[PDB]
Structure 1
């Protein structure tokens, strides 16, 4: 068989390839930014007062 079976055309094939590459780039950038932010927060919070920062509020505010 052949000549077309749930297939696409080259003009649409290249467009789909470019769209997929762009989406993958955006997703990778977002994931890297999120990971960098998480690492920064972990480095800044691991110094001290890990649970006290929330305990003070749980004691002040309504539990």
Structure 2
């Protein structure tokens, strides 16, 4: 208990529990974003990738 970072075993493994929970939160967010990205990639790749952007490039002020 003299090197920087030394903390009680209680704090050490409780911070572990919190770390695992936060990693779960981030993992779920990441995969959700990617799974969604894959959904619209399926829907858009089938046709009109550039036409869909151009039509509103024009409708509103470019």
Q: TM-score, normalised on structure 2? A: 0.88
RMSD: 1.4
Higher normalized helix content (fraction of residues): 2
Aligned residues: 62
Structure 2 runs not aligned, ≥5 long: none
> Where do 4+ consecutive residues of structure 1 move more than 2 Å?
2-6
User: What does 1:1-63 correspond to in 2, within 5 Å?
Assistant: 3-63=2-62
Structure 1 runs not aligned, ≥5 long: none
